[model samples]
Target: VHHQKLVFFAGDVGSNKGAIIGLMVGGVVIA
Candidate 1:
Protein backbone atom coordinates (compact mmCIF):
# COMPACT_ATOMS: atom_id res chain seq x y z
CA VAL A 1 0.00 0.00 0.00
CA HIS A 2 0.97 3.55 -0.61
CA HIS A 3 1.40 6.28 1.98
CA GLN A 4 -0.38 9.59 1.83
CA LYS A 5 -0.77 12.67 4.03
CA LEU A 6 -4.01 14.60 4.26
CA VAL A 7 -4.93 17.80 6.05
CA PHE A 8 -8.40 18.83 7.09
CA PHE A 9 -9.32 22.29 8.27
CA ALA A 10 -12.63 23.41 9.69
CA GLY A 11 -13.80 26.76 10.98
CA ASP A 12 -16.84 27.38 13.15
CA VAL A 13 -18.06 23.85 13.07
CA GLY A 14 -20.95 23.43 15.58
CA SER A 15 -20.66 25.53 18.77
CA ASN A 16 -16.98 26.18 18.36
CA LYS A 17 -15.94 29.40 16.67
CA GLY A 18 -12.30 28.34 16.43
CA ALA A 19 -10.34 26.60 13.73
CA ILE A 20 -9.65 22.89 13.66
CA ILE A 21 -6.68 21.18 12.13
CA GLY A 22 -6.81 17.48 11.35
CA LEU A 23 -4.01 15.39 9.96
CA MET A 24 -4.45 12.02 8.36
CA VAL A 25 -1.35 9.85 8.48
CA GLY A 26 -0.92 6.87 6.20
CA GLY A 27 -4.35 7.62 4.75
CA VAL A 28 -6.03 7.02 8.06
CA VAL A 29 -8.54 9.29 9.73
CA ILE A 30 -7.49 8.12 13.23
CA ALA A 31 -10.77 8.51 14.99
Candidate 2:
Protein backbone atom coordinates (compact mmCIF):
# COMPACT_ATOMS: atom_id res chain seq x y z
CA VAL A 1 0.00 0.00 0.00
CA HIS A 2 1.13 3.55 -0.69
CA HIS A 3 0.67 6.49 1.67
CA GLN A 4 0.77 9.02 -1.14
CA LYS A 5 0.64 12.37 0.65
CA LEU A 6 -0.54 11.07 3.98
CA VAL A 7 0.68 13.08 6.94
CA PHE A 8 1.07 12.07 10.56
CA PHE A 9 1.45 14.20 13.70
CA ALA A 10 4.03 13.54 16.42
CA GLY A 11 4.28 14.75 19.97
CA ASP A 12 4.80 13.79 23.64
CA VAL A 13 1.07 13.73 24.37
CA GLY A 14 0.30 12.64 27.94
CA SER A 15 3.93 11.58 28.40
CA ASN A 16 4.58 14.79 30.30
CA LYS A 17 1.14 16.20 31.14
CA GLY A 18 -1.03 13.16 31.81
CA ALA A 19 -1.01 14.08 35.48
CA ILE A 20 -2.14 17.63 34.75
CA ILE A 21 -4.21 17.07 31.65
CA GLY A 22 -7.23 18.69 33.25
CA LEU A 23 -5.21 21.88 33.69
CA MET A 24 -4.16 22.21 30.08
CA VAL A 25 -6.05 22.45 26.79
CA GLY A 26 -4.17 19.92 24.61
CA GLY A 27 -3.18 17.54 27.39
CA VAL A 28 0.52 18.23 26.71
CA VAL A 29 3.18 20.24 28.52
CA ILE A 30 3.91 23.90 27.72
CA ALA A 31 7.68 23.74 28.10
Instruction: Encode model 2's per-residue lDDT on 1-31: one tens digit a residue.
Output: 5434343336555454333322334544555
Q: The CA-based lDDT of model 2 is what?
A: 0.41
TM-score of each: 0.22, 0.16
lDDT of 1 by residue, 1-31 (tens): 6545445445554564554445424543332
Candidate 2 minimal-lDDT segment of 10 residues: 16-25
Candidate achieving the largest TM-score: 1
**lDDT (Cα atoms) of all candidates against the true structure:** 0.46, 0.41
RMSD of each candidate relative to the true structure: 7.8, 10.8
Clashes of each: 0, 0
Distance from true location, Cα of 27 in model 1, Å: 21
